[PDB]
Structure 1
Amino acid sequence: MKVEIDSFSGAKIYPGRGTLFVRGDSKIFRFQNSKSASLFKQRKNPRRIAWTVLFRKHHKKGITEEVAKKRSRKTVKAQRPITGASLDLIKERRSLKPEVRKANREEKLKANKEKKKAEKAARKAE
């Protein structure tokens, strides 16, 4: 079995207890009680009716539901390899990064290479 919710009061409708209504547009309403039913037929607004759950929740009364959204104070904690880099050697080369004389000497080599490049290019142009 199941329990349901009055359209008007928003109340548990234990089985059998209460009425049901089926408008021509196929909207199925349920009513715990003829009180709610009669108000509905009067075309009242539960948000204006005071004892109703809609008014309750629209005026923010009994607000023990929500508390807050949690936040984690840390990082993802994965400086992992990219599946083709061998993380051990990856960290080894990351540590070799400081004391950058290796890359500096490669730059100096390609630098004298650019020197000789302009030189030999001018030579061929001559």
Structure 2
Amino acid sequence: MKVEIDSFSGAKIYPGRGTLFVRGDSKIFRFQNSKSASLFKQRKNPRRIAWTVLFRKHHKKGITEEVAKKRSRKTVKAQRPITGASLDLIKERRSLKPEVRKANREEKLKANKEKKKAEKAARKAEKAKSAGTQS
């Protein structure tokens, strides 16, 4: 069972209470009693009628509890595999400290330094062929 709210006064409407208007467009309006109903019919503006939720909001009457309510939290956790990387490859990789990196590194870094100058002499090779390669 639902408590509707008065669409002029913001008042709680319990089952059976008040009335429900259905306008031409089809905007539904609900009033809690015949006072809000009437003020609505007179084309009053809730924002200028002081007892309403709407006026009270537009005039910062009340609040105070909301300017007090601040903070609260809680968060987080850990790690999942990646397919082609079990948590173990991930432990193994992550763990190993710089001196093995530099090691690994400067090895390969020397290892293909060889490949480079090797392919280079390979160029001059198919070229002292191609500045020869006769009849």
- Where on the TM-score scale, by shorter chain, does this alignment land: which range? 0.5 to 0.7
- Change in Cα spacing, 1:101 to 1:42, as seen in structure 2 (3 Å) is closer
> Which residue of structure 2 aligns with residue 18 of structure 1?
18
Q: Secondary structure at the match of 2:49?
A: coil
Q: Compare 96-105 and 55-64 and name the one that shifted more.
A: 96-105
**Which of the two has higher C-alpha Rg?**
2
- Change in Cα spacing, 1:66 to 1:123, as seen in structure 2 (3 Å) is same
The Cα offsets for residues 43-101 of structure 1, whole Å up to 9 and x where unpaired, read as 11101211100111222333267579987888743244324323234323323242136
Q: Secondary structure at the match of 1:72?
A: coil
Runs of 4+ in 1 over 6 A off after TM superposition: 67-75
2-structure distance, mates of 1:72, 1:108: 52
Q: What's the % identity of the aligned pairs?
A: 100
> Which residue of structure 2 aligns with residue 103 of structure 1?
103
Instruction: Note the C-alpha offset of 1:112.
Output: 5.8
- Change in Cα spacing, 1:104 to 1:2, as seen in structure 2 (3 Å) is closer
The Cα offsets for residues 3-32 of structure 1, whole Å up to 9 and x where unpaired, read as 321111112222333222222222221212
CA RMSD in angstroms comes to 3.6
The Cα offsets for residues 23-42 of structure 1, whole Å up to 9 and x where unpaired, read as 22222212122211221111
2-structure distance, mates of 1:89, 1:43: 73
2-structure distance, mates of 1:99, 1:22: 79
Q: Secondary structure at the match of 1:100?
A: helix
- Change in Cα spacing, 1:96 to 1:116, as seen in structure 2 (3 Å) is same
- TM-score, normalised on structure 2? 0.64
Instruction: Identify unmatched segments of 5+ residues in structure 2.
Output: 127-135
Instruction: Identify unmatched segments of 5+ residues in structure 1.
Output: none
